[PDB]
């Protein structure tokens, strides 16, 4: 509902985000809205030219085409909304793909912990290279990297979800 991203390790953030169906469904909707936005504009064209299907004699029954005409404004608004939805889905699909590329890998997190347990075992000669501080400091980097990517992926997809 209202999660705190820096409260949990990067292993859970990377586990939830890295393994899923994929963005293939968001692009499937983006291209559907855009194709649906061309139909709303295409039909608005042939509807605005409804006259011409009426023969010469118009003495009478012009009220017919005049009652179907107000809906051309409806088809323009419908094409606009359907065109914005295609951009929302297209943007949300890009936020995920980049957030995944920024999330630290689980194998990168596993290798971090594995190397920590072995540096604690034997570290005398190379102790001014401070490998314990760097490895532990390299973990908090992944801690903050994951917590930052999620805080942005929220506001990125949260902003790409608001409309009207």
């Amino acid at each position: 509902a209202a999660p705190i991203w820096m409260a949990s390790p990067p292993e859970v953030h990377s586990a939830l985000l890295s393994n899923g169906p994929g963005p293939g469904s968001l692009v499937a909707a983006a291209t559907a809205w855009s194709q649906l936005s061309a139909e709303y504009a295409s039909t608005a064209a042939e509807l605005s030219g409804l006259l011409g299907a009426v023969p010469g004699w118009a003495w009478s029954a012009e009220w017919y085409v005049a009652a179907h005409l107000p809906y051309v404004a409806w088809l323009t608004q419908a094409s606009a909304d359907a065109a914005g939805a295609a951009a929302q889905h297209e943007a949300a699909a890009a936020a995920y793909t980049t957030a995944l590329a920024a999330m630290p890998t689980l194998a990168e997190l596993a290798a971090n912990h594995v190397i920590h347990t072995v540096l604690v075992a034997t570290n005398f000669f190379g102790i001014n290279t401070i490998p314990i501080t760097l490895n532990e400091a390299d973990y908090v980097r992944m801690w903050l990297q994951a917590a930052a990517v999620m805080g942005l992926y929220q506001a990125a997809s949260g902003a790409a979800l608001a409309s009207a």
Partner: protein, 73 residues
């Protein structure tokens, strides 16, 4: 149907059927979009898009209906 409105009714009838054809060509895909992952953002946003996709499909569906029945004279 009146005498000279035969081609007019056939024109409006041909485009309301074209909308329903495109309305259903994209109905199942914009109403049920699956999250790309399991994090709470991919679920909240994909659930919002589906919430928008269904609220949009029902308004445009009845709109085609109200369009096709505008001629009662």
């Amino acid at each position: 149907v009146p005498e000279g409105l035969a081609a007019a009714s056939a024109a409006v009838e041909a485009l309301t059927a074209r909308l329903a054809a495109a309305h259903a060509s994209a109905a199942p895909v914009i109403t049920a979009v699956v999250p790309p992952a399991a994090d709470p953002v991919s679920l909240q946003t994909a659930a919002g898009f589906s919430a928008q996709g269904v609220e949009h499909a029902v308004v445009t569906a009845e709109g085609v209906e109200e369009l096709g029945r505008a001629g009662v004279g």
